[PDB]
Amino acid sequence: MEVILLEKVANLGNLGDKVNIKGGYARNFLLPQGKATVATAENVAAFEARRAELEKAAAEKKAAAEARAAQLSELVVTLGAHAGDEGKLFGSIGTRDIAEAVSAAGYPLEKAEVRLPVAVHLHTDVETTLKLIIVA
RNA sequence: CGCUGUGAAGAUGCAGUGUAUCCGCGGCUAGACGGAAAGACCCCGUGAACCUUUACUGUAGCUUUGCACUGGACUUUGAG
Ligand SMILES: [Mg+2]
Ligand SMILES: [Mg+2]
Ligand SMILES: [Mg+2]
Ligand SMILES: [Mg+2]
């Protein structure tokens, strides 16, 4: 399945390269979310008609990513929820309700890639090692 | 009608012979191979059915792997 990219993917992302991928990589991940588009012999024609105005935007969203990742890299924001122990609380210490904790002291910081299986991820080449402290 | 023979081989009907007027009624069941059911036993039909199994050939189901749905990455794995 020949597709051309819109955003850059981690392994094969050249943002417009003729990439041959399994049919399940597209149709289930890339096309629905939006990270690429099928080459229909005209999408590539219309990609150059929009590449000039899109790669500058892609840098701009990337530029805002590092600015936001570095602006709020020194917060020690603490929750006021009831807890039983530092690590074993009455609720759940996870990326489910901390959105309002960081939004009240700066950027909203919508939680989509705050990895915690506190390194928050926001772009392919941008990642911040935030540290969360909770009083218990 | 009986008897003795004969006879598809156990006779009311054939032969010989004996007995015996015609016709009921109440009884009895020895025979009419008495009535009833195209013997069920037995054998046969290149008949049926249902049942069994390590009869044959199949098959539901269960199970194995290939391919599709079906993808990313990292690692132990041959030749270019
Ligand atoms: Mg006689
Ligand atoms: Mg009587
Ligand atoms: Mg009779
Ligand atoms: Mg008969």
Swiss-Prot record:
**Record bears the keyword RNA-binding:** yes
Q: Fetch the InterPro entries from UniProt.
A: Ribosomal_bL9, Ribosomal_bL9/RNase_H1_N, Ribosomal_bL9_bac/chp, Ribosomal_bL9_C, Ribosomal_bL9_C_sf, Ribosomal_bL9_N, Ribosomal_bL9_N_sf
Annotated GO biological process: translation
Annotated Gene Ontology cellular component terms: cytosolic large ribosomal subunit
Q: Which GO terms describe its molecular function?
A: rRNA binding; structural constituent of ribosome
Q: Is the Oxidoreductase keyword given for this protein? A: no
Concerning PROSITE patterns, the annotation shows:
RIBOSOMAL_L9
- Which UniProt key words apply to this protein? Ribonucleoprotein, Ribosomal protein, RNA-binding, rRNA-binding
Give the record's family classification: Belongs to the bacterial ribosomal protein bL9 family.
The function of this protein is:
Binds to the 23S rRNA.
The protein in question is named Large ribosomal subunit protein bL9
**Source organism:** Pseudomonas aeruginosa (strain ATCC 15692 / DSM 22644 / CIP 104116 / JCM 14847 / LMG 12228 / 1C / PRS 101 / PAO1)
| Name of the gene | rplI
